[PDB]
Write a protein that binds this ligand. Structure first.
Ligand SMILES: Cc1cc2nc3c(=O)[nH]c(=O)nc-3n(C[C@H](O)[C@H](O)[C@H](O)COP(=O)(O)OP(=O)(O)OC[C@H]3O[C@@H](n4cnc5c(N)ncnc54)[C@H](O)[C@@H]3O)c2cc1C
Ligand SMILES: N[C@@H](Cc1c[nH]c2c(Br)cccc12)C(=O)O
Length: 637
């Protein structure tokens, strides 16, 4: 009988197949001939976009140890070509067929296929991905539509990509919204560019959930009164977060869109716009679209006449060309019968770590946990080590399953509280998930074992990418030592994000919210750095039309649209005049000061250590024994 059957091979299954081949575990893959969305987008020539996730979090450790030389955002073409390169390695192990039913029993599972062939396996892994209706909308989208009005009822990464393609052709975008969370995918720290995944320092949650809440949540929750932040200029971008009932922040279930801020897009791509646009690097600054009025937010109750294709706002019956409603992604799961009898019903919170459904036996889910920020690779690489250890080591399989129900209950209370299950429950902060899996597997690090300040920087400030836990130990990948060294040298050993915790150690949430936005350019949604890129935007729109071979008449002025923009931007026109020039930027001066201190005692032992320095050395000493380190779902009962 087959030891392992993997149903679905695209991207999530790659790191698991690598570990099974290394231990020479008997496995077989069954994946359909149709392929994935990247296959459909390749055949139609629609891989002309880039990832919302950084290279260091979007490619696997065993690829990064060879190819990493700098931080950047890969293209969809590079992402798919990596999918194809690995499929070529493992094509001999893939049966091209479609699984239609799985009958799960106490020790094995009976797998049925579309061709009629039957397979038995002791361990079954599902890595089939998700179905999304927006995928087909992207696959049939005509990029030549011009001078039309579009109404979106949902905002997301796919809607933002569609808007990025609609803006340059003089298309007007109406968002009937109940709010959305948008974050600059790259920010500046003292002028230097940082992708947002670099500044999350998740292990500071072990100090206190309140400190880490003040570290992260001011750009999400309306905590600052600073008139330069987008959620003060456009209050309809605010979401209702009354569902949050956990003390772990950012909460599980929170989703955000990652976009190019126009100032960072200009920094990277201005000197070769047409080539970068053709490569897939598209300006998608939703904050810039609201600033210029190319996108307006209207209340969700704004009346739409779907018969006449009109939307009534600002006393205007605005005709629209197309209405866009996003869907909810659902896992591509085949029919699964518990004990061969009872249909299994998927529920993320009824699985352990998104991997182990407790209603089934020896069935594992790979690729259904979504990262809040960064690429899926961080999640699926850690999931693949977790699944591999469960499959190949019976004492670990036993240790996890003996109290599986209690682990799931303890996990849900920690990350969801008393909140009822939501459709977005599968979204987790990547630095929390990778660390949780590392502690479950035993490839984690110990904060009490740091001896120098450099050790505390690596533990707390170095991002919890998958490869961070593959330097030594059971699942070490060769070359990670050089990779971690290269990453440390290019990011000043992450002292800058370490210093942020130093700077807000004695602040309350309101003081930290104001300190976050006291910078000349605060990380996310800074509306002071948009107007200065208006002329560049015109250059961008022209470069886009040349790449796409489009002729767009942008002379006819839409006085009706300008009237709706004025109605929609009343709050902006009231709060933006209150933006005041300042002589000191507290965050910049505090972070620059702390970096000087940290880099001066970088190699000193913590035991071998006039006031800011004194409270910082005390803060550094307390880091050896964090008081919020307990994670109940890690324990065996
Ligand atoms: C438009 C879009 C943009 C994205 N951008 C990013 C990004 O920037 N960064 C990021 O980290 N992630 C991104 N993702 C998510 C992720 O990278 C992709 O979803 C990727 O395909 C990984 O999914 P997967 O390998 O789990 O499943 P897939 O690769 O989608 O599918 C695995 C395979 O399983 C097969 N299969 C399914 N059901 C069966 C069955 N019953 N029997 C047999 N075979 C089956 C399918 O045919 C498919 O070929 C994006 C996703 C989409 C749709
Ligand atoms: N702590 C840094 C970066 C940061 C804050 N909040 C974030 C969220 Br939410 C997602 C990703 C990154 C960040 C800062 O304060 O600028």
């Amino acid at each position: 009988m087959l030891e392992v059957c993997i149903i679905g091979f695209g991207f999530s299954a790659i790191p698991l197949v690598r570990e099974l081949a290394r231990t020479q575990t008997e496995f077989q893959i069954i994946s359909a001939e149709s392929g994935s969305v990247w296959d459909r987008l390749s055949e139609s020539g629609r891989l002309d976009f880039s990832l919302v996730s950084s290279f260091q979090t979007s490619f696997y450790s065993f690829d990064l140890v060879r190819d990493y030389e700098k931080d950047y955002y890969p293209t969809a073409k590079q992402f798919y070509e990596m999918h194809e390169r690995w499929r070529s390695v493992y094509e001999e192990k893939i049966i091209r067929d479609f699984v239609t039913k799985i009958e799960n029993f106490k020790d094995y599972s009976l797998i049925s296929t579309r061709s009629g062939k039957t397979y038995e396996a002791k361990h079954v892994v599902l890595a089939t991905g998700f179905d999304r209706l927006m995928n087909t909308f992207l696959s049939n989208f005509d990029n030549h539509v011009s001078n039309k009005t579009f109404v979106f009822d949902t905002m997301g990464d796919s809607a933002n990509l569609l808007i990025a393609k609609l803006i340059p052709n003089n298309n007007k975008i109406i968002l009937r919204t109940n709010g959305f969370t948008a974050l600059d995918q790259e920010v500046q720290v003292l002028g230097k560019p940082f992708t947002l995944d670099q500044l999350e320092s998740p292990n500071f949650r072990y100090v206190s959930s309140e400190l880490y809440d003040r570290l992260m949540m001011s750009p999400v929750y309306p905590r600052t009164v600073n008139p330069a932040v987008s959620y003060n200029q456009f209050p309809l971008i605010r979401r209702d977060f009354s569902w949050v009932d956990s003390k772990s922040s950012p909460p599980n279930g929170l989703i955000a869109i990652k976009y190019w801020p126009i100032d960072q897009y200009y920094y990277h791509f201005n000197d070769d716009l047409e080539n970068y646009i053709s490569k897939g690097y598209l300006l998608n600054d939703i904050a810039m679209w609201l600033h210029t009025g190319k996108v307006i937010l209207v209340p969700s109750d704004t009346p739409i006449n779907f018969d006449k294709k009109t939307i009534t706002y600002a006393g205007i019956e605005r005709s629209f060309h197309q209405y866009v409603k996003g869907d909810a992604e659902q896992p591509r799961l085949p029919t699964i019968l518990i004990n061969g009898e009872t249909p299994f019903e998927y529920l993320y919170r009824d699985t352990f770590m998104g991997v182990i459904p407790q209603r089934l036996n020896n069935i594992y889910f790979l690729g259904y946990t979504r990262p809040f920020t960064g690429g899926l690779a961080n999640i699926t690489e850690m999931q693949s080590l977790f699944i591999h250890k469960l499959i190949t080591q019976p004492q670990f399989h036993q240790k996890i399953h003996q109290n599986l129900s209690k682990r799931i209950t303890a996990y849900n209370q920690h990350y969801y509280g008393a909140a009822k299950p939501r459709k977005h429950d599968h979204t987790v902060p990547f630095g929390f998930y990778t660390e949780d899996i590392a502690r479950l597997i035993g490839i984690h690090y110990q904060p009490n074992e740091c001896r120098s300040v450099r050790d505390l920087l690596f533990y707390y400030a170095f991002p919890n990418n998958a490869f961070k836990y593959r330097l030594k130990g059971e699942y070490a990948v060769d070359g990670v030592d050089e990779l971690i060294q290269k990453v440390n040298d290019k990011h000043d050993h992450y002292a800058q994000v370490f210093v942020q915790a130093l700077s807000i150690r004695n602040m309350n949430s309101d003081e930290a919210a104001e300190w976050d936005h006291s910078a000349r350019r605060f990380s996310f949604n800074d509306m002071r750095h948009k107007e200065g890129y208006r002329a560049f935007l015109d250059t961008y729109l022209k470069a886009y039309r040349q790449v796409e071979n489009i002729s767009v008449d942008d002379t006819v002025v839409d006085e009706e649209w300008n009237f709706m923009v004025k109605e929609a931007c009343q709050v902006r026109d009231k709060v933006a005049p209150n933006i005041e020039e300042k002589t000191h930027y507290s965050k910049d001066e505090d972070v620059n000061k702390g970096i000087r201190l940290i880099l001066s005692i970088l190699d000193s032992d913590i035991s071998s250590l006039c006031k800011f320095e004194a409270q910082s050395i005390e803060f550094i000493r307390r880091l050896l024994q964090p008081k919020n380190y307990e994670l109940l779902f890690i324990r065996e009962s």
